[PDB]
Amino acid sequence: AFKWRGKPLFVRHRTQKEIEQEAAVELSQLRDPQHDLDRVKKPEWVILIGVCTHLGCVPIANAGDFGGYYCPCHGSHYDASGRIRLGPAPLNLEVPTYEFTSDDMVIVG
Amino acid sequence: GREFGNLTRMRHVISYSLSPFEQRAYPHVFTKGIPNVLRRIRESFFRVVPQFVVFYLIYTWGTEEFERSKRKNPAAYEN
Amino acid sequence: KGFSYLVTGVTTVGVAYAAKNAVTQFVSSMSASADVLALAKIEIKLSDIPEGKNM
Amino acid sequence: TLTSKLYSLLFRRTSTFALTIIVGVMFFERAFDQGADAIYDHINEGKLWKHIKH
Amino acid sequence: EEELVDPLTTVREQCEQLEKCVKARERLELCDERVSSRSHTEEDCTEELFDFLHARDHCVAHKLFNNL
Amino acid sequence: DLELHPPSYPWSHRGLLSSLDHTSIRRGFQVYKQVCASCHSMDFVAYRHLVGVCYTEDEAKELAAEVEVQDGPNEDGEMFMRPGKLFDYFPKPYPNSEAARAANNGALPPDLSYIVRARHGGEDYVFSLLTGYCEPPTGVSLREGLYFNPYFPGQAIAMAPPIYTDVLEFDDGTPATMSQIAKDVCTFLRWASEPEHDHRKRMGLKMLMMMALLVPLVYTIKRHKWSVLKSRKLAYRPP
Amino acid sequence: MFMRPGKLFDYFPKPYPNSEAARAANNGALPPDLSYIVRARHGGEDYVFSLLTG
Amino acid sequence: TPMRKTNPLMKLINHSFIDLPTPSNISAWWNFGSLLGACLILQITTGLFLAMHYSPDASTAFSSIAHITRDVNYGWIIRYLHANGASMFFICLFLHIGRGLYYGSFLYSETWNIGIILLLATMATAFMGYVLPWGQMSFWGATVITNLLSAIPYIGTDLVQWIWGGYSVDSPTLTRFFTFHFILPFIIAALATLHLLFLHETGSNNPLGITSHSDKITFHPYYTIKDALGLLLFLLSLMTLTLFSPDLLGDPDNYTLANPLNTPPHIKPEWYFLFAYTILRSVPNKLGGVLALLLSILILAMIPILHMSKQQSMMFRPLSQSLYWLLAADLLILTWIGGQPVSYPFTIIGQVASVLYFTTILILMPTISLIENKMLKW
Amino acid sequence: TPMRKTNPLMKLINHSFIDLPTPSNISAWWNFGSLLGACLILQITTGLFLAMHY
Amino acid sequence: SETWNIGIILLLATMATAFMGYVLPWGQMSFWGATVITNLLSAIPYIGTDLVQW
């Protein structure tokens, strides 16, 4: 977790097993449909805003029913991709405009 | 009205009162006081207590069930 | 009446004691704090020679 | 009788009632504070640093 | 030579002789045998370890500060 | 992961009118300044606050002067070092959080000024955290920079066992077993978190006595005033 | 702490780290902050110009 | 004529306080209202002395509170009196509302509406005040409660950012909350004066629920001492709460400096908001949960309309008594679940409790009232 | 009877402001009480908004 | 008379409010005027300095 605009920014180096788990998730089951690869420029790296889409809480990583994220406030469960699947959260974790200029860097203006 | 002079109409209702210094601050403490409190508690007990007893049962069951669910099942790794 | 007035007087004595304690506590809270009080007389100036004028 | 002089001198006029109330407040404050402090010191004797500093 | 005996250890052992601490410890040993025997398993003896430590330290707290 | 409830140890000050053992507070302060001060800061405790709890003013001055601190800028604006005075707070081991994380394998040693009151279970937990450092149970593995501790929420703390027998030599001379050391630290931390403990207990006893005096008296006054109504008898005499 | 190229939100550079350095570098005199110098002097800008002129 | 009836200020004081016709059979519950005002005074006085040292900055709020507790003379007493006095204020407020529900005081429609506004202002005041310490719980609770406004369909995020004073809770938010927390209690006092003004027109109600014009009594020599005794008991409770268990009604996580990069594992609001927290959690949809909380608070407005009984008081309605105590037990269930996390049993029990709360206050109560009306052959 | 004479708040407002008997010959000097009230309201609002950032 | 006395109290309250508000900016004028006006209370014969320091 990093600090951007006074808000948490999550960068998770999800393993390929987590990538398979996220890809296998059906779009119909998702509350807000979205393909896993759409929200990750690189499959092994997922960059999101560490703010629960329900009531601005820091989702706990590798926790919950789906082992991606878990809201400690109202019980919202997010997957490794950040998509909401169970809980009061209305939509998926926000994806910033991150650009991988190099394999070891990520910046944007 | 709003002042004590004109509030309602009453006729031939006579009341007797005693000075606070003449009488006792604690009369009938044991002859009537404690029995009166006991009868009040008896009257109000069975219309209040059952709801909180149900609440206590729900509380205990919920806590025990949360503890039971938190515990791990061996069958998950029998193989 | 003397017994009743004695009861009232003892009650008033207790109330006055409690009220003075509360008022003094609040007023003292308005007074100088411990951190301010510490840096009051401990500090000692070490002055050099500033020419022949007021410094 | 005790009351025949007490009530006639102290509790008769409310000004004297207030005066004896305030004097009793002073004496009660002093004595009650001393007694409470003694009780608290005795209950946890040795723990307090007032005893240790000796 | 090691004069300090750390009464904590003595009280801990005193529980380890009591019925609840003993049965929790033996259940922990059974769980350890299970996990060690299985080559590939995700089962962690943390639960039974906590079950043992709760009773152990409960007895300790009952009879520890007296020595100190 | 699950969590372990810390036992309720029979601390001396837990009594209704009990007070902190100031000898224990002094020993715990010694352990803090000699063992935990290398990583744990106390930003809200100065070298005063000790003039009336465990140290006289003179020995407090000496103890403060033992450690040098940075002073305000002098001529040319070159901030120098001072011998150290009472109003100075306890030294911070690291200039900033980043230095603490770098020196502690990415972990930040938390401020211990309010640690007792900032953790569920209070001092009990802190004691249970220091005493309990069992080896990892079968089936759990952790990074070399982490040590298994059953009472630590995550169960993998980044703090090596800080106290062991004879790690410190108490001025009093009591046997410096790890249990005694941990108990003394916990007492000192309880004092630091709640310095008003003794005064609060004294005022609580005083208010208990005052209320035991007043409540029956005010109740008697109310009964006396209302006896006119409660004994009032009324009759209906229609013509 | 490191050096950064400098962004919009940064304030104008401070010539001296503290007042003591300014006094040392300016013969014991402190050069006042110029952010409010016009409003801080009687006559305002009219004064400042004259100060720079005469 | 006595001077009290000549000077206009003395006229008002005598008419409203000294010689106010008050029912003789009034029980202890009517004390709480007076206690509320006292609590307000306490919160206005004590909090004032806290403001003389509190610095409303995100970088110095926690340090300022530490300075208050450790350096300021008797400052710990003042801070603990303030916190536990807020707790006691909500205790007395809940008991006041429960009494009003039980004895049919809601039929004073305008007084009831004014009281609802007072409750809302008190809740906002306490929320911002709890945000003031700038602890972990304070910060994250503030973030959650302000993000609640994001549920609004169109102006959802603009309003939240306007309240925040930025893109997230920070020093701007704390200073705004400090100012609102300072101003609001005086608005509460004026609204309470309006409360008493609207109550004065009809006078106080009695437990029997029958007009007590036959047995009215001056307030000066009877209810003054009865309230004084109530004040003594309230101060007993408050002082025992601040002097023996000062942190009984507190959260330890609030003693850690606010960290915007890590939400505590068990972030919960203060205990008076726990029922609203459960009603939030139970409803899945975010807007649904926000609306559920709003209805949970504002159902007191609809309560007078649902009154369908020939008797104002409930002491002669045993079935209504059973329903009322069931509602109270339900509220206790809600508070307890609010204390508890979001897991298998607690979630379902909370959903059931919220549904039961709404049904009892909307369906069971009027039906039982109609049944009781038929029972007495009206 | 109009609503002014029925609702107690409306009673107060009508008696003290809407229907308050005042002299007709009152000059401009009596306008400064309302001006003082407006000054107080303005000061309260403006100071609240200032303290929001102070 | 009563209205006049209430007005005098109002004037005193407004003067105190404005004085403290002018102290609030913490400018040179604010600081030094505050020092002067507060030290004015040192004239009190017996409790002068204690009151000023309080």
Ligand code: HEC
């Ligand atoms: C030389 C370094 C060092 C020593 C010695 C040390 N600590 Fe720590 N402490 C740390 C670090 C680093 C952590 C972070 C571990 C973690 O959070 O996983 C820590 C963790 C803690 C925690 C856990 C706080 C939490 O978030 O739960 C407490 C309480 C604590 N220490 C108190 C103590 C006490 C009491 C002593 C000795 C009497 C002590 N420490 C000795 C550096 C130290």
Ligand code: HEM
């Ligand atoms: C700061 C909060 C409040 C204050 C200071 C306050 C004050 C008072 C006082 C002093 C009384 C006099 C009678 C009594 O004490 O019982 C009263 C009565 C009443 N209050 Fe409030 N109150 C508050 C909140 C509320 C709330 C939250 C409600 C309803 C939700 C409410 C509704 C009523 C009603 C209906 C009465 C009529 C009592 C009767 O008929 O006997 N008040 N209030």
Ligand code: HEM
């Ligand atoms: C109904 C009235 C009030 C309520 C319900 C209330 C409630 C609270 C609460 C719950 C806190 C948190 C304290 C803590 O958690 O430690 C707080 C803090 C604070 N309040 Fe009050 N308050 C009230 C009135 C006031 C008033 C009138 C003022 C100022 C004039 C004030 C100033 C403060 C300050 C400065 C703090 C921060 C100090 C602290 O947190 O201890 N409050 N308030």
Ligand code: HEM
């Ligand atoms: C009786 C009405 C009031 C008067 C006469 C008054 C007067 C003043 C004055 C003369 C200043 C100094 C202005 C300057 O030199 O910059 C000031 C500043 C201030 N006042 Fe007030 N004030 C009043 C009401 C309020 C209220 C109700 C607040 C509520 C927070 C408030 C908050 C402030 C603040 C925060 C400042 C500092 C910011 C500034 O200097 O402008 N004032 N006031």
Ligand code: FES
């Ligand atoms: S904040 Fe994540 S569930 Fe509402």
